[PDB]
Motif scaffolding. Structure first.
Motif, PDB file in Angstrom:
ATOM      1  N   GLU A  74       0.827  -1.210   0.000  1.00 16.05           N
ATOM      2  CA  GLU A  74       0.000   0.000   0.000  1.00 16.05           C
ATOM      3  C   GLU A  74       0.863   1.264   0.000  1.00 16.05           C
ATOM      4  OE1 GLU A  74      -3.393   2.476   2.537  1.00 16.05           O
ATOM      5  OE2 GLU A  74      -2.856   0.456   3.211  1.00 16.05           O
ATOM      6  N   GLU A  75       1.887   1.272   0.854  1.00 18.86           N
ATOM      7  CA  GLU A  75       2.762   2.431   0.986  1.00 18.86           C
ATOM      8  C   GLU A  75       3.606   2.641  -0.270  1.00 18.86           C
ATOM      9  OE1 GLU A  75       4.142   1.001   4.726  1.00 18.86           O
ATOM     10  OE2 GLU A  75       3.230   2.636   5.849  1.00 18.86           O
ATOM     11  N   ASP A  77       2.606   1.742  -3.376  1.00 18.08           N
ATOM     12  CA  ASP A  77       1.665   2.309  -4.328  1.00 18.08           C
ATOM     13  C   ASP A  77       1.324   3.776  -4.033  1.00 18.08           C
ATOM     14  OD1 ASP A  77       1.570  -0.077  -5.791  1.00 18.08           O
ATOM     15  OD2 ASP A  77      -0.209  -0.794  -4.747  1.00 18.08           O
ATOM     16  N   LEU A  78       1.191   4.137  -2.771  1.00 18.49           N
ATOM     17  CA  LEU A  78       0.825   5.521  -2.447  1.00 18.49           C
ATOM     18  C   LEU A  78       2.008   6.497  -2.473  1.00 18.49           C
ATOM     19  CD1 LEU A  78      -1.784   5.001   0.393  1.00 18.49           C
ATOM     20  CD2 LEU A  78      -2.229   5.668  -1.977  1.00 18.49           C
ATOM     21  N   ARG A 181       2.064  -5.049  -6.065  1.00 19.60           N
ATOM     22  CA  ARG A 181       2.235  -3.608  -6.126  1.00 19.60           C
ATOM     23  C   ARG A 181       1.470  -3.106  -7.332  1.00 19.60           C
ATOM     24  NH1 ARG A 181       8.679  -3.649  -4.803  1.00 19.60           N
ATOM     25  NH2 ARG A 181       8.543  -4.690  -2.758  1.00 19.60           N
ATOM     26  N   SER A 183       0.691  -0.360  -8.628  1.00 21.05           N
ATOM     27  CA  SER A 183       1.199   0.756  -9.431  1.00 21.05           C
ATOM     28  C   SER A 183       2.333   0.319 -10.371  1.00 21.05           C
ATOM     29  CB  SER A 183       1.712   1.881  -8.525  1.00 21.05           C
ATOM     30  OG  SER A 183       2.763   1.412  -7.685  1.00 21.05           O
ATOM     31  N   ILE A 205      -8.337  -3.623   0.089  1.00 22.36           N
ATOM     32  CA  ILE A 205      -7.453  -2.460  -0.023  1.00 22.36           C
ATOM     33  C   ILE A 205      -8.162  -1.226   0.519  1.00 22.36           C
ATOM     34  CG2 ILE A 205      -6.137  -3.285  -2.034  1.00 22.36           C
ATOM     35  CD1 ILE A 205      -7.957  -1.484  -3.773  1.00 22.36           C
ATOM     36  N   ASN A 208      -8.017   5.068  -0.079  1.00 21.81           N
ATOM     37  CA  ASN A 208      -6.957   5.867  -0.702  1.00 21.81           C
ATOM     38  C   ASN A 208      -6.215   5.076  -1.775  1.00 21.81           C
ATOM     39  OD1 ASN A 208      -7.727   7.763   1.099  1.00 21.81           O
ATOM     40  ND2 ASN A 208      -5.910   7.627   2.408  1.00 21.81           N
ATOM     41  N   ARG A 209      -5.839   3.843  -1.462  1.00 19.23           N
ATOM     42  CA  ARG A 209      -5.164   3.010  -2.449  1.00 19.23           C
ATOM     43  C   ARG A 209      -6.067   2.767  -3.655  1.00 19.23           C
ATOM     44  NH1 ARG A 209      -2.661  -3.014  -1.618  1.00 19.23           N
ATOM     45  NH2 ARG A 209      -1.042  -2.944  -3.219  1.00 19.23           N
ATOM     46  N   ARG A 212      -6.179   5.874  -5.903  1.00 22.17           N
ATOM     47  CA  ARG A 212      -4.961   6.100  -6.685  1.00 22.17           C
ATOM     48  C   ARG A 212      -4.815   5.086  -7.838  1.00 22.17           C
ATOM     49  NH1 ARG A 212      -0.763   8.848  -4.023  1.00 22.17           N
ATOM     50  NH2 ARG A 212       0.213   8.717  -6.090  1.00 22.17           N
TER      51      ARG A 212
END
Ligand SMILES: [Mg+2]
Ligand SMILES: [Mg+2]
Length: 222
Positions: A74-75, A77-78, A181, A183, A205, A208-209, A212
Motif C-alpha cells: 500500500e505504501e 503504491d501511495l 504492487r 502501481s 485495499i 486511498n489506495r 490512486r
DNA sequence: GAATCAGGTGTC
C-alpha cells in the motif's frame, strides 16, 4: 577499514540496506546494523549463496545490534518505491536499540532521520552495509516463502515476487492479489476495473489506495 | 562466482 574511519570520526555507525525494491509483490525490507565483533565472510548479499547468507546471518544475529523495517505494498503504491524504501530504512533505525550517530547507507540520494552518507556499491565497500544487506535479504525471503503458504498458487518461495516468467504466468492464471504492487507496470496492465472495485468492496485495499490505482488504470494504455 | 538472458522504478 571504511567503517572504522567513519566509526572514529562520528562514533556509533550503523550500515543500512534494503531488499525488495524491484519486486512485483510484497513489502520492501530494510535492515540497520551496528557491529563491533568481526564476522568473517561478510560481503554484499548478492555475492553469497542463500545457504551462506543463512549462516552468515546466524552469526550476525549473535554479534550485532539489528533493526528491521518494512513498507507495505500500500505504501509503495501511495508513496512510490523510493519514498517507501526510505520509510522502511527509517523504520529499521527506529527498531535498533543501539541508536547510531551516523549512518552508512547503500546507494545514492537517501537522507534518513539520522545524518549519514550514501555509498554507491555500498554493500561491498562497507562491512556494516554488507551485513545489513544479508539481514534484509534473508528476512525478506522468509516473508515471501510465508506468502507462498498463504497463496498456494504462487511460487513466492522461489521467485520472491519478482517479475519472473512463472510469476507472470501465475498472475495471468490466478489473478492479481492485494499484496501485488498495483502501481507497477506489469501488474497494472493485468489489473481490471472489476477486480479493483472487488478488492475495495471486500475490504482488501484501503479507499486511498483504491482511488490512486483507479486513476492509474484510467490513465493506462495512454 | 561469472556470464548473460530476463524483468521491475526511483534520482537528476
Ligand atoms: Mg540489497
Ligand atoms: Mg549494489
Amino acid at each position: 577499514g571504511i567503517d572504522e574511519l567513519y566509526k572514529k570520526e562520528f562514533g556509533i555507525v550503523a550500515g543500512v540496506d534494503e531488499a525488495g525494491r524491484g519486486c512485483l509483490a510484497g513489502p520492501v525490507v530494510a535492515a540497520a546494523v551496528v557491529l563491533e565483533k568481526e564476522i568473517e565472510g561478510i560481503n554484499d548479499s548478492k555475492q553469497l549463496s542463500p545457504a551462506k547468507r543463512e549462516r552468515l546471518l546466524d552469526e550476525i544475529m549473535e554479534k550485532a545490534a539489528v533493526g528491521i523495517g518494512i513498507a507495505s505494498p500500500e505504501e509503495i503504491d501511495l508513496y512510490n518505491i523510493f519514498n517507501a524504501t526510505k520509510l522502511a530504512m527509517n523504520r529499521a533505525l527506529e527498531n535498533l536499540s543501539v541508536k547510531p550517530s551516523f549512518v552508512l547507507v547503500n546507494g545514492k540520494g537517501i537522507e534518513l532521520s539520522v545524518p549519514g552518507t550514501c555509498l554507491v556499491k555500498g554493500d561491498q565497500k562497507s562491512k556494516l552495509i554488507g551485513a545489513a544487506s544479508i539481514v534484509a535479504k534473508v528476512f525478506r525471503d522468509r516473508l515471501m516463502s510465508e506468502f507462498h503458504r498463504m497463496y498456494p498458487q504462487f511460487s513466492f518461495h522461489k521467485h520472491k515476487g519478482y517479475a519472473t516468467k512463472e510469476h507472470l504466468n501465475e498472475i495471468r492464471k490466478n489473478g492479481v492479489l492485494p499484496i501485488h504492487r498495483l502501481s507497477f507496470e506489469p501488474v497494472l496492465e493485468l489489473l481490471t476495473d472489476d477486480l479493483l472495485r472487488e478488492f475495495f468492496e471486500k475490504g482488501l485495499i484501503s479507499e486511498n489506495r483504491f482511488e490512486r490505482i483507479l486513476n492509474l488504470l484510467g490513465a493506462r494504455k495512454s
